[PDB]
Design a protein around this ligand. Sequence first.
Ligand SMILES: Nc1nc2c(ncn2[C@@H]2O[C@H](COP(=O)(O)OP(=O)(O)NP(=O)(O)O)[C@@H](O)[C@H]2O)c(=O)[nH]1
Ligand SMILES: Nc1nc2c(ncn2[C@@H]2O[C@H](COP(=O)(O)OP(=O)(O)NP(=O)(O)O)[C@@H](O)[C@H]2O)c(=O)[nH]1
Ligand SMILES: [Mg+2]
Ligand SMILES: [Mg+2]
Ligand SMILES: [Mg+2]
Ligand SMILES: [Mg+2]
Lengths: 395, 395
Amino acid sequence: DLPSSFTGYFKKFNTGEEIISQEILNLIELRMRKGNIQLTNSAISDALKEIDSSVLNVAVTGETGSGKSSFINTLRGIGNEEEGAAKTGVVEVTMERHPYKHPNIPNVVFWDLPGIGSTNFPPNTYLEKMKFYEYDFFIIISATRFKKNDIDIAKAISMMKEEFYFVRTKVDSDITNEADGKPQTEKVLQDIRLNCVNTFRENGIAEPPIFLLSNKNVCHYDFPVLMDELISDLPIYKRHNFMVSLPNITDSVIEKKRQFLKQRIWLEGFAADLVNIIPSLTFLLDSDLETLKKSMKFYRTVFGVDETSLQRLARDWEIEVDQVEAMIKSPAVFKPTDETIQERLSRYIQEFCLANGYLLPKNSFLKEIFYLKYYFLDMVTEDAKTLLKEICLRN
Amino acid sequence: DLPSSFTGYFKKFNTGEEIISQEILNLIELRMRKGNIQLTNSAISDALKEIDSSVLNVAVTGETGSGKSSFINTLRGIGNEEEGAAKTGVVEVTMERHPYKHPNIPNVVFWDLPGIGSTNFPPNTYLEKMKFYEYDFFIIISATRFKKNDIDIAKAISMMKEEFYFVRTKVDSDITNEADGKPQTEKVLQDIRLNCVNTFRENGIAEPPIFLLSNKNVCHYDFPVLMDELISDLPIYKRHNFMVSLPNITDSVIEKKRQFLKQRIWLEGFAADLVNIIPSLTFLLDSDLETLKKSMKFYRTVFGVDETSLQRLARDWEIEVDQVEAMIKSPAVFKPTDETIQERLSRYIQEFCLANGYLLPKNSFLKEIFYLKYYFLDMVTEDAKTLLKEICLRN
Ligand SMILES: Nc1nc2c(ncn2[C@@H]2O[C@H](COP(=O)(O)OP(=O)(O)NP(=O)(O)O)[C@@H](O)[C@H]2O)c(=O)[nH]1
Ligand SMILES: Nc1nc2c(ncn2[C@@H]2O[C@H](COP(=O)(O)OP(=O)(O)NP(=O)(O)O)[C@@H](O)[C@H]2O)c(=O)[nH]1
Ligand SMILES: [Mg+2]
Ligand SMILES: [Mg+2]
Ligand SMILES: [Mg+2]
Ligand SMILES: [Mg+2]
């Protein structure tokens, strides 16, 4: 039956890839069996509302000149040259916090916090004037080893039953400087991980795990692990909003993004009344057409394959966007061509259903718009991996 | 007579533009009158030797993340991307000094000094392990206001009868952040100059003058004044080597460079035996031809009009060097063209002497090579100003 099926699509994903908890999924299944379409749709819409309305506030504290402002621009996927991005080299020194919303996901805000050092208030008033209660978790950055200042902040955070994370930036510079001129014969990474703990263990018991990374190289070292760790500690419903905002550094992250978005499509489709009508018949409406345009540009912006991000492969090899656009099939979706869109989308739907079935029990179907979303999602995901390969060979 | 004339060319320059002191010029004039060509030439060659052999060691101390490493690359005229330049963002943290010679003037070495803060030794051993006696003068950098650490270093420097200079970097970021969003109605510069003194005056009496500048904008604010101030405090004979290494930020600096080089040409010409032979006759030798090539590429590298620096106008407007080379007459000197070089240099000499005479009393002349140097020097200087205009309109 339908209740059985909706429950199961959630099962093909991993336990850490759940867009919604098992507590609510069983609540939706229960309502569905009741037969009251009103309450069922409402519960699903509420779940979607909870996810979409979910706000994440990340507080970042750290000594000057470590890479925390560049760390803000890194996760946001923004260069250190833009005006909307955090000032990457220069430091504010306002004793005043400044928020930074994600360019694509406004519900994601990063806070650059003044180091306790150079604050003009006793740490008792430091934390209060900060308003740290509002944040979901803390990120602690240090360019070298973590000093007492940073450590004392950590202890307070741990004491308040909140999560914190130590981030050691500029690891690339250490390896380069230490290795420079020496023979070919990952020792630097091991020395730094101990050095951070050596200062920790001196005053602070039970040194926590520390992540060594480089804001200039998001794809290597412990950068991937940190993102994975942050999501797991976050509440189930909060993972969705944060996940899509993360940098597309690997195929795993890209695929993970696809998986979450796939579940949201499933949810959205179910929130809408199901039908007995097979898609790919007659023509689509302008309203549903515009909704696909908004959904498409949303998927493209998340996987960094949007026209704005298409500006940044043009600089990698000095190659115009058109040339970059040819590799991927994303931009060539809403392009005015002789081959109408009403006849083009009619083609996408047929290929998808023949290869993947209708995803639902016989005689039951999702609205046409939802099947197109799965197709686009798959298309953009594949494009992200294709674009990724070209990116990795350079720089 | 000849003694009278050699003395006078030095007089047409400013008192602060003297490549050599009045104490030695009078020594050269005395020897000349004696008639002993041996001692006279030797004295001049010694003067040239003293200047050329002159070594300058600049120690730079400062708290982390102010712009002192970028300050090293700024004066050297090197980007923050090169390997030979000081690591511009990242910080060494080796508790160990590192030298940086000028790319064109090896006798100019900049030292990035670890802040007293984070040194593991008492300041009594700090100064000693530093070996600060070797430096001619100190540059003190601070990204905001100067702390007790910096101030105590300053007091010790002042106490040792040595010159020091306070440099406040990143002033551009302060003005931008403070002005951001506000109406059109130089207040920021006045507030910072007092803030530096406010911390100074608290413990340190007689606040010294402080220079506000930006490593991202060498041409504006107090950057020009600092260079002028540094040279004046330096010993006469040491000015030459440092001057030519300085960034070509203004016409005044470029003209000043020309003036010093003009005096050196004069000296070099006099060190060589003078003749009764007029130049621009017959043909030049390959040895003198090669000497002109070395002297030309030397002048071009100083005024930043060399082929290496010609790479950096190509990025300003995305314009190939050839296009940049057309504006200036520097690169088109040693280009294989139908119009031989033996006939080309024969043209430069005639135009120069007709417009500027022989610079010496009747029947007396400098060697041909020296007149060509004056011509090239003038040509390169004019090219520097021409190139400067194109640079200033952009960025
Ligand atoms: N090699 C390397 N350099 C880095 C890294 N992160 C930052 N930097 C360097 O440090 C500068 C960035 O300073 P910034 O990020 O503002 O420091 P911060 O950690 O944000 N703290 P603050 O906000 O006090 O400055 C840049 O000039 C850049 O060269 C990194 O991961 N690797
Ligand atoms: N706006 C602005 N930013 C600057 C200036 N100087 C440096 N910066 C910024 O700060 C970083 C440079 O750090 P750096 O120069 O190494 O600091 P420093 O003063 O050399 N001291 P240290 O050697 O300890 O780092 C760059 O990322 C750059 O954005 C300046 O004059 N203006
Ligand atoms: Mg910041
Ligand atoms: Mg929490
Ligand atoms: Mg340095
Ligand atoms: Mg001195």
